[PDB]
Each structure stands twice: as structure tokens, then as C-alpha cells.
Symmetry: C2
Subunit: 114 residues, 2 copies
């Protein structure tokens, strides 16, 4: 009960379903997604497995600089409060749509949810 | 590079409460401590944990029905996606305000945040 919040995003052209978590301190990308997208080579292991500082995430028709902390997990991408605030977003549950940057994308349906 | 989490003021059986707004949480939670203090623990549908089906939560000037899962935790009230969807809210990070039910309230500053 209670379908979680997800949005569609593209990283290096790879389509991804991202979980929107306001209770999370930082945005995260899975090691395997970093691999698949080729972002593995840009992982700053300056010490969790490393951090990708300003990758270009695509949401709708806009590329936005998002920072990810790479972790070995089943969740490919977790949009945290840190990134939610940076791009002054609005989690509109009434309109069931996410508004981030200068764009506005919808929340995946129960089915389209991973 | 820290960021203050999302909290808002609410009242439960008249007691002021700093509540955490977590879209990552499926279920809204109320601590055993708060439940016992406010007395809502007597409505708990079950070591005082269980389920509160209906409770009037005051946000700004409106009283709205909410359900809680009472667990022994530190956070006194964690508002989950379940209640954020039930009351068709909007987590406006541009204005640092929460629009829920037929009301609008702002988030607490790092100073107001519980610790």
C-alpha cells in the first residue's frame, strides 16, 4: 500500500527510474548504474565507494548538474534532499508531478514503478 | 556540505511537535514516547506499540485526520508519503513551505530542528 515516488530521467542516454526521497541527506547512484552509463571512470574515490561530483542528469528537456555518492545497492538512483533543494524543487502530490529546475516531470504509475 | 532536513510544526492533542517530512517513508510514524505523553497510546490498536487509525493533527489552523504507526523511536512524528498523498500536499523547496490539506506551513530552520 502507498506507491512510492519515481520520475523518469536519462543519464548518458540511459533511461532511469529515480526514487524521490525527501528524508535522505544525499543523492545516490548504484555502482552498476555508474558502470552501465560509463560514469565509473569519473568516480572520485577521495575518502560508500566514491563520489561523482557534477554529472549531467537529464529530466525532460533539461540537463542538470547532479552530484552522486556511489553505493552498491539495488536502487539505481535516489534523488535526495540535497539535490532536491539545490534545484529548488516541488514534490507536488496534488498534481502528482515533480517540479525541478525549470522543468516539470510526472510521477511513475503503480505499474511503471520498478 | 550538509543540508537541514524537512521539519514542520504540528500539534497532537494540543502538544506542539516538530515533525519530519519524509517522502521516502511509506508509513507515517509516531513515537511511543509522544503517544504515551499525549495519551493517544490508549487508542493504540495492538511494549506500547501498534496502530492508530484516526487522529486529529493540527497544522496551522486546520485539524486533519491522520493515521499513525506507533513505534519506539526518537523522531516524535515522521510524516510519510501515505499522509502526504491523503492530504494532497506539495513539498515546495523553492519557498521552504509545506502545503498540506487546505493549509500552508513553512519548514523549520536548522536552529528550530530537533537534536
Amino acid at each position: 500500500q502507498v506507491p512510492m515516488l519515481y520520475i523518469n530521467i536519462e543519464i548518458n542516454n540511459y533511461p532511469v527510474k529515480a526514487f524521490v526521497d525527501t528524508g535522505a541527506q544525499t543523492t545516490i547512484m548504484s555502482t552498476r548504474l555508474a558502470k552501465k552509463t560509463g560514469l565509473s571512470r569519473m568516480i572520485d574515490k577521495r575518502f560508500i565507494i566514491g563520489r561523482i561530483h557534477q554529472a549531467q542528469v537529464k529530466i525532460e528537456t533539461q540537463y542538470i548538474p547532479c552530484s552522486f555518492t556511489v553505493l552498491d545497492t539495488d536502487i539505481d538512483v535516489l534523488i535526495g534532499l540535497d539535490m532536491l533543494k539545490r534545484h529548488l524543487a516541488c514534490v507536488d502530490l496534488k498534481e502528482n508531478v515533480l517540479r525541478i529546475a525549470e522543468v516539470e516531470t510526472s510521477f511513475l504509475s503503480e505499474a511503471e514503478i520498478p
